[PDB]
């Protein structure tokens, strides 16, 4: 199984630097070129650069958008890809993906990581408040939720019953309002199952290392 996993994303100030990593397994790393690609929220993919394979001397190339400011390197002992980013600006705010690239034979990016989110801002890290959404006084089905309010930067992750409830879940994209994000998540279950069984939302905000379980208790 091929695995690519980016790490190192988070909040940084304008003018600052950041280094991202991309750990790989499940293929002969040195055989492959590796690329970095970014995507600002709601916008198109942008190719940033690659580093070539052993056959081509591990040389690098960059889009003119980032040449001179970003550097790509690789650890061939450990199968890890790196992106050094300097003089960061608002426009660098994006999800960064590593992608397995050329092997000398195929023209394709066969595999991509899950991506790591970089936020370039002067704003402070603020952990979320997490509030249960339980029905008032108010059926075959019941809808519950969690409100994840007033955090910065993105992202947060929300699961229900540690991921065992996945069907009938909707997580509403975060909205920024006076410098903080708020998001919500709904889960719908048969009413014969709640509150008789426990329903809990699990919320993580990596920038503040926040981990929350909030059980949804009937009022």
């Amino acid at each position: 199984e091929v695995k690519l996993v980016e790490s190192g994303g988070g909040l940084v100030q304008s003018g600052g630097s950041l280094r991202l990593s991309c750990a790989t397994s499940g293929f002969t790393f040195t055989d492959y070129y590796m690329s970095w690609v970014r995507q600002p929220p709601g916008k198109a993919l942008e190719w940033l650069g690659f580093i070539r394979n052993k056959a081509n001397g591990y040389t690098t190339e960059y889009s003119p958008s980032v040449k001179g400011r970003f550097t790509i390197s690789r650890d061939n002992s450990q199968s890890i890809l790196y992106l050094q980013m300097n003089t960061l600006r608002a426009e660098d705010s994006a999800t960064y993906y590593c992608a397995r690239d050329h092997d000398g034979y195929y023209e394709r990016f066969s595999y991509w990581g899950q991506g790591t989110l970089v936020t370039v801002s002067a704003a402070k890290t603020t952990p979320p408040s997490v509030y249960p959404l339980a029905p008032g006084a108010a059926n075959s089905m019941v809808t519950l939720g969690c409100l994840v309010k007033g955090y910065f930067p993105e992202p947060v992750t929300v699961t229900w019953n540690s991921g065992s409830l996945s069907s009938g879940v909707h997580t509403f994209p975060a909205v920024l309002q006076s410098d903080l994000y708020t998001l919500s998540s709904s889960v719908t279950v048969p009413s014969s199952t709640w509150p008789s069984e426990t329903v809990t939302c699990n919320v993580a905000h990596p920038a503040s290392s926040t981990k929350v379980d909030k059980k949804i208790v009937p009022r």
Binding site: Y131, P135, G136, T143, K149, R219
Partner: peptide, 11 residues
């Protein structure tokens, strides 16, 4: 399908 939720006591 519309659902309304009051503020939580913890908020």
């Amino acid at each position: 399908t519309v659902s309304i939720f009051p503020p939580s006591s913890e908020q």
